[PDB]
Design a protein around this nucleic acid. Structure first.
Ligand SMILES: [Cl-]
Ligand SMILES: [Cl-]
Ligand SMILES: [Mn+2]
Ligand SMILES: [Mn+2]
Ligand SMILES: [Mn+2]
Ligand SMILES: [Mn+2]
Ligand SMILES: [Mn+2]
Ligand SMILES: [Mn+2]
Ligand SMILES: [Mn+2]
Ligand SMILES: [Mn+2]
Lengths: 77, 104, 95, 92, 93, 108, 85, 101
DNA sequence: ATCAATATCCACCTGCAGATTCTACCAAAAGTGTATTTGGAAACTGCTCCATCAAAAGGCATGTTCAGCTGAATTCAGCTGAACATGCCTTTTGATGGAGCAGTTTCCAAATACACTTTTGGTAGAATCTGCAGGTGGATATTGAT
DNA sequence: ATCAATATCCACCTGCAGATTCTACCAAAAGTGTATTTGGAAACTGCTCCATCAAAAGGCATGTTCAGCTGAATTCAGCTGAACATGCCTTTTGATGGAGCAGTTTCCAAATACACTTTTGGTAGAATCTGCAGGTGGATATTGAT
């Protein structure tokens, strides 16, 4: 599933970040970091979800999880 | 006849007051605290919308979109430090190519 | 036959993608990944807006990490982002 | 029935740029911003009241919180506007 | 004048884990800081949880969710074990 | 009148449940506080205190002393991954740092 | 009134900056590090002292306390243990 | 004859790294540090001769020395990344931009 | 530095679908008018704790010398990474059905708040205890020159 | 591969500053007993979300070619570390005066409580408008050859 994060997509993310030349081992490295990030957020998000006794995570749950990792996100309520 | 009108504000003094009483902040809330807080919020909103309208009409549009807010916030040092750990959804980044990467 | 020198098309894509704000990961692979991680933790449903919010957060995180790591790349007199650059940036950030 | 700051943000926008509009997503950005700064100031003011064993949040706690939370010139202008609003509200 | 502290209980717990070890006053100050910091973290997150869900009461369920959100991994598992076990033993009688 | 038992004793705890309850009700956290919430919180605080004191006693008798000083607390925390993450933005007065010389700097 | 304090950032001597660098593991030190370190230290102290005296004066006091310093540090995300009195 | 004894450059630096990483004493002299703090406090408008309790000054020095030491560790990581051994101003400024300062 | 030859970028247009503005209605906040209560500001006061003071000694800061090793500057080949054409399959898009699940209401049984009234654990000194700091002096490792 | 020069380590010792125990008082839990809330148990209902499907396109996977970067190897001027003499100023210790924290009392300006009346903000279609998909066509940059 982590391979669905395609190499051209990682290349695009890097270009938005200003990177002009990209080593061949970055892509699997990038997948690693993204996995950790997603795990940390999702664990917190569904935690909020199950505290409210719901089986559907909402945008507000994601917002609370992000803000508790110090990454406040604007635009989703 | 509203509290906002008497303070010369657009932001709602009475709603700010109710949110203060119901946010578990203190046993009591003084009469001037919602007025002061509403005024500060209206000021910060005015600063951001000022810069964002400027950025939006600089690129030949009359509609504020997230990109304009992002350029406004990131291109102003004090707003940038105030919102330094905030990400503006669909705002992108500032154009920035490090000079060593241009040819010559 | 026409052929650009290595680097020119890269600077063009830097310019194209820093002026745009679209999501850069395709939706289905990302949402499938997210659902898999969610199950590997817990059988929950997902609001669509919740998945969009997650993807914005993740792509912003990755872009800013690339910026920091590239600062390290240029500090080391290189132009090629390398895994060491990303790892050192995440050490200095505090993760 | 859901509350938001859209009405008042639109009023302030009409004051600052009468013929500029705002998209739905940017209005959500602005709601997020207003709620974030509110929670910041109100939380700091709550902690200030508690540190000093006071039970009431007054405009003095709001002003100290604004001083602690905003940078430099932003803090000066916000304090000026807040004090001015409290004066005009007390006059009437 | 009279100042409360957690020193008594920190020292009791120290004797439980290390019967022949003592603690210097500066180290006891570190430990008092630790207890107050973790208290504020857990209680603040529990307050936020209760508010998000429009409940006016902070119950042990909010304490448990906050412990899961704030502590890492094995620490969180064991903290939940101890809290749940203390709450059952206290409620039985 | 019945015999006075403390809430800590009924929960089998060293940390004071009643003082935690007073701190919860007077910290403006919520209009109401449930009966078990101070017990659960006092138990977690006692657990985490026990963990730090266990590791710090270990560090103190590794350094052949019988009194925990701040340096021992710092060695305890930094040498344990999970405590280190929990206290990652914490400064421990007079705790120093962990010995760490990068290998590239040793003589050839 | 006290005596006049001037040019005190120079009291942060070069050997003290060296000791700080050694605790940080630094083996070789460029000659321009000392003025950089003084700059950084002054910026840090200004931010924390500004916040500390804000707490002090909100409390209607003329004495900075350890808790004032602790609160200012914590508002900069730098929690300090050991000074809770 | 005789030569006077002399350690090679680097030996004493590693000696002092070892010596100061096992110790926990404050490394800035106390009085100059307190004068710096008092001068900055006065030069700040809200300072109208505030007093300082002794614990407050010790707390500030602890925080400031921990901050500087960790900034030196981070900047030195950047130094080594650049295949150098000499810490340079560039390293410190880049380390604090990446930290978020 | 020029020309000639592509290739890409980007300013500008139109017709219109989709996004906002604009109307009107209505629960639900906000505001009002009284009636009471009370948190904390003032105004003492008692007494810690800070701010200077002074002197002594001895730990270190400073300035100097000079040589070793470092950073900086250059060169260059191997091999990595970029650019690109081709064709294939994963993702998008659209539809349709239905489950299951988030909101909402109405009651109470259970839980919590609070004022009084015993009851005790916790705190502040005092009174004792006791690691360990801070001295020797020998043993053992490390370093640098030969 | 050795030795001389240092540095570091390590065991042992004792007196005292700092830590641990001991008392007695009293604030603050604990116990009791009524008074308010509230959190779900059942019972709904309308709607987001998931699950299949199906076709298509446009984005990606692959393989080829080669330009230019990265890492390695060299050279060297000068910067920074090491060692040291000198003497300054930081640290200790104790005193001395007084500012100003903090404990206590009194008492209103301000805050809360409550019953009712207005007013607003939110919502959902109708009515307007604006970006935007998808075209240029000129401007601006890139590439290779001279
Ligand atoms: Cl007020
Ligand atoms: Cl409970
Ligand atoms: Mn001055
Ligand atoms: Mn009162
Ligand atoms: Mn070199
Ligand atoms: Mn007793
Ligand atoms: Mn010793
Ligand atoms: Mn070649
Ligand atoms: Mn209206
Ligand atoms: Mn277009």
């Amino acid at each position: 599933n982590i391979q669905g994060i395609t190499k051209p997509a990682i290349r695009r993310l890097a270009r938005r970040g200003g990177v002009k030349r990209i080593s061949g081992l970055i892509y699997e490295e990038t997948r690693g970091v993204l996995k950790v990030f997603l795990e940390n957020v999702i664990r917190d998000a569904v935690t909020y979800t199950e505290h409210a006794k719901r089986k559907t995570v909402t945008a507000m749950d994601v917002v609370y999880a992000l803000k508790r990792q110090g990454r406040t996100l604007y635009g989703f309520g | 006849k509203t509290r906002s009108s008497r303070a010369g504000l657009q932001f709602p003094v009475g709603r700010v007051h109710r949110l203060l009483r119901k946010g578990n902040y203190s046993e009591r809330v003084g009469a001037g605290a919602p007025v002061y807080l509403a005024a500060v919020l209206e000021y910060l909103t005015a600063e951001i919308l000022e810069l964002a309208g400027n950025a939006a009409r600089d690129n030949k549009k009359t509609r504020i979109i997230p990109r304009h807010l992002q350029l406004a916030i990131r291109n102003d040092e004090e707003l940038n430090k105030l919102l330094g750990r905030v990400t503006i959804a669909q705002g992108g980044v500032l154009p920035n190519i490090q000079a060593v990467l241009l040819p010559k | 036959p026409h052929r650009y020198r290595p680097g020119t098309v890269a600077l063009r894509e830097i310019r194209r993608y820093q002026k745009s704000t679209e999501l850069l990961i395709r939706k289905l692979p990302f949402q499938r990944l997210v659902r898999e991680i969610c199950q590997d933790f817990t059988d929950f449903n997902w609001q669509a807006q919740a998945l969009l919010a997650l993807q914005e957060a993740a792509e912003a995180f990755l872009v800013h990490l690339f910026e920091d790591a590239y600062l390290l790349t240029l500090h080391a007199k290189r132009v090629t982002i390398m895994p060491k650059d990303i790892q050192l940036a995440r050490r200095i950030r505090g993760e | 029935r859901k509350e938001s700051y859209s009405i008042y943000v639109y009023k302030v926008l009409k004051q600052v740029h009468p013929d500029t509009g705002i998209s739905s997503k940017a209005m959500g950005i602005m709601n997020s911003f207003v709620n974030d700064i509110f929670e910041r100031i109100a939380g700091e003011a709550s902690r200030l009241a508690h540190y000093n064993k006071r039970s009431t949040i007054t405009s003095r706690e709001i002003q100290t919180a604004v001083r602690l939370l905003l940078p430099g010139e932003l803090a000066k202008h916000a304090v000026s506007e807040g004090t001015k609003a409290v004066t005009k509200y007390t006059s009437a």
